[PDB]
């Protein structure tokens, strides 16, 4: 069957820690007071929660309340533990409280206020400098959570909250996040279609932090090339074909050969034969001011089929693309 894989960094972070850290099922939730929070307006509803702008009446501060749907139980406890472990980390959303919602009778997570604007609202109109600046800020969040033994697994523009006026960023929605344990097989039904890594699309379960680096590369490609999304699949199958039209089929078959993966036979009639395209193929008069040799070299090193070959978050922070960013 498939050949096993291990992360090349932060491999054994969870193995050395006491079970209290990663055994989210044994965690005891310290319940706050639901009356401290007054709901103001509904911001949105996703698959697993409803999100509201609210006010913390004990200090008049604005907060965000995420009321969980009563679907999964193990999933709820995992999100709370991950948020508590990461609290105070660079550009990580701050969990302020956990209360029991009086109506839904489910946990409600209370977060520090952020502007009601996601990165998808701004990321197609940034300058070259601001793409570099904000990507460096996202990398600080990813290296921190990876160093803490956690993969986000849902990196996408909607999950990056930005306050452009204040040049501040937060990585949000840790509901799909998981503790990395070497040799563990994970569910491939994570991330949004356009940001899914080839490991998810070929059903390779022993993936790691590097999945977040492919999703980050998809975001960068969409920003520097002004193409939303960069890989525009009609479904999870066509998503891999769209990737193969850019990266080529030869490196795809080498990746599948290396990990001894059984590619779904559905692909035999749709994948075709494609050579790797040079990154200059995507450059045009409308995006050329966002492209540089450094941007293309950095993107090339994130968008690799082999998850073990992608830059790690710390390696990404060292790249020449960020030499222009004031630190
Ligand atoms: C601050 C904020 C806003 C919306 C959200 O959905 C989240 C979250 O899921 O963590 C956080």
The DSSP output letter for 125 is S
Among the three residues 89, 113, 137, which one is the final residue of a domain in this structure? 113
Q: How far is the CA of 179 from the centre of ligand 1 (A)?
A: 20
Q: List residues forming the annotated binding site.
A: 43-51, 66
- Tokens 């204040």 identify what position? 166
Q: Rounded to the nearest 10 degrees, how much is the dihedral formed by the CA atoms of 113, 115, 120, 121?
A: 170
Annotated binding site for ATP: 43-51, 66
| Centre of ligand 1 from the C-alpha of residue 226, in Å | 26
Say whether both 55 and 129 belong to one domain.
no
The separation between CA 70 and the C-alpha centre of its own chain, rounded to angstroms, equals 24
Technique used by the depositors = X-ray
CA-CA distances (angstroms) from residue 276 to 148, 251, 302?
35, 8, 15
Q: Are residues 278 and 223 in the same domain?
A: yes
Angstrom resolution of this structure: 1.5
Which residues have C-beta within 8 Å of that of residue 31, sequence separation ≥ 6?
A: 98, 99, 100
Cβ atoms within 10 Å, residue 223: 28
Q: Are residues 35 and 139 in the same domain?
A: no
Domain shared by 90 and 146, yes or no: no
Largest pairwise CA distance in the chain = 63
Whole-angstrom Cα distance, residue 218 to residue 204?
19
Answer whether 82 contacts ligand 1 (Cβ < 6 A).
no
* Euclidean distance between CA atoms 286 and 89, whole angstroms: 37
First-to-last C-alpha distance (Å) of the chain: 47
DSSP secondary structure, 139-152, as one string: HHHHHHHHHTTEE-
State whether 82 and 41 are in the same domain. yes
Ligand 1 pocket: which of 53, 111, 121, 171 to mutate (most atoms within 8 A of CB):
111
Judge if 99 and 11 occupy the same domain.
no
Boundary (domain end) residue, out of 87, 113, 139: 113
Cα separation, 12 vs 6, in Å, equals: 10
Considering only CA atoms, which of 136, 67, 74, 145 is closest in space to residue 103? 67
Q: Is the CB of 160 under 6 A from ligand 1?
A: no
**Cα of 201 from ligand 1 centre, angstroms:** 27
Nearest CA to ligand 1 atom 4: 51
Alpha carbon distance 153, 213 (integer Å): 10
Residue 293, number of CB atoms within 10 A of its CB? 10
**Geometric angle at alpha carbon 242, from 177 and 238, rounded to 5°:** 80
Cα distance between residue 322 and residue 325, in whole Å: 5
Cβ atoms of 298 and 112 within 8 Å: the answer is no
Closest CA to 91 of 317, 309, 311: 317
- Are 138 and 88 in a shared domain? no
Pocket test for ligand 1, best of 172, 174, 175, 177 (most atoms within 8 A of CB): 172
Q: Strands 107-112 and 37-45, how do they pair?
A: unpaired
Please state the φ and ψ torsions of residue 171, each to the nearest 5 degrees: -85, 120
H/E run at residue 30: none
Q: How far apart are CA 159 and CA 175, in angstroms?
A: 11
Task: Classify residue 20 by burial, with Cβ atoms within 10 Å: 0-12, 13-18, 19+.
Answer: exposed
- CA dist list (Å): 237 to 242, 243, 263, 265: 9, 10, 11, 11
- Are the beta carbons of 129 and 306 closer than 8 angstroms? no
Whether 40 contacts 56, CB under 8 Å: no
Task: Let me know how long the chain is.
Answer: 327
Which of the listed residues 93, 113, 133 is the one where a domain comes to its end? 113
Q: Assess whether the C-beta atom of 111 lies below 6 angstroms from ligand 1.
A: yes
* Whether 130 and 107 share a structural domain: no
Q: Cα–Cα distance between 108 and 97 in angstroms, integer?
A: 8
**Displacement of CA 243 from its chain's centroid (Å):** 18
Question: In whole angstroms, what is the distance from residue 110 CA to residue 121 CA?
Answer: 24
DSSP 262: -
128 and 183 in a single domain? The answer is: yes
- Residue of minimum CA distance from atom 11 in ligand 1: 172
Whether 66 lines ligand 1, by a CB cut-off of 6 Å, is: yes
Query: What's the rounded Cα separation, in Å, for the pair 208 and 184?
Result: 9
CA 226, CA 287: separation in Å to the nearest integer? 6
- 176 and 186 Cβ atoms separated by less than 8 Å: no
Return the beta strands (E) in the chain as ranges.
Answer: 37-45, 49-56, 61-68, 95-100, 107-112, 150-151, 160-163, 168-171, 178-179
Range of the domain at 327: 5-22+114-327
The count of structural domains within the chain is 2
Q: At what angle do helices 236-247 and 249-258 cross, to 10 degrees?
A: 110
Helix or strand (DSSP H, E) at 237: helix 236-247
In a shared domain, residues 144 and 224:
yes
- 248 contacts 274 by C-beta, under 8 angstroms: yes
Same-domain pairing of 316 and 262: yes
What is the CATH classification number for the domain harbouring 267? 1.10.510.10
DSSP 8-state symbol, 93: P
d(CA 144, CA 63): 24
CATH (domain of 36): 3.30.200.20
Cα separation, 97 vs 87, whole angstroms: 11
Same domain, 97 and 189: no
Active-site annotation, residues: 154
Tokens at residue 201, please? Answer: 């699309």
Question: Rounded to the nearest whole angstrom, what is the distance from the C-alpha of residue 170 to the centroid of ligand 1?
Answer: 9
């Amino acid at each position: 069957g498939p050949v096993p894989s291990r992360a090349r960094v932060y491999t054994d972070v969870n193995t050395h820690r006491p079970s209290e850290y990663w055994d989210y099922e044994s965690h005891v939730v310290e319940w706050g007071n639901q009356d401290d929070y007054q709901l103001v307006r509904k911001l949105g509803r996703g698959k697993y929660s409803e999100v509201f702008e609210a006010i913390n009446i004990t200090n008049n501060e604005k907060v965000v309340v995420k009321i969980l749907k009563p679907v999964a139980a193990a999933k709820i406890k995992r999100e709370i533990k991950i948020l508590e472990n990461l609290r105070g980390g660079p550009n990580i959303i701050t969990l302020a409280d956990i209360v029991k919602d009086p109506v839904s009778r489910t946990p409600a997570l209370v977060f520090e206020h952020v502007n009601n604007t996601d990165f998808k609202q701004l990321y197609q109109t940034l300058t070259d400098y601001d793409i570099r600046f904000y990507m460096y800020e996202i990398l600080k969040a990813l290296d921190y959570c990876h160093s803490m033994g956690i993969m986000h697994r849902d990196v996408k523009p909607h999950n990056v909250m930005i306050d452009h006026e204040h040049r501040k960023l937060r990585l949000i929605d840790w509901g799909l996040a998981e503790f990395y344990h070497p040799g563990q097989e994970y569910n491939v039904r994570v991330a949004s279609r356009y940001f899914k890594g080839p490991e998810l699309l070929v059903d390779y379960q022993m993936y790691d932090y590097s999945l977040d680096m492919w999703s980050l590369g998809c975001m960068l490609a969409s920003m520097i090339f002004r193409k939303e999304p960069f890989f525009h699949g009609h479904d999870n199958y066509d998503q891999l074909v769209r990737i193969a039209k850019v990266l080529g089929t030869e490196d795809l078959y080498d990746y599948i050969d290396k990990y001894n993966i059984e590619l779904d036979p559905r692909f035999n009639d749709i994948l075709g034969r494609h050579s790797r395209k040079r990154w200059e193929r995507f450059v045009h008069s409308e995006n050329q001011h966002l492209v540089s040799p450094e941007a293309l070299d950095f993107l090339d090193k994130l968008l690799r089929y082999d998850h073990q070959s992608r830059l790690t978050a710390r390696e990404a922070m060292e790249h020449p693309y960020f030499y222009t960013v004031v630190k």
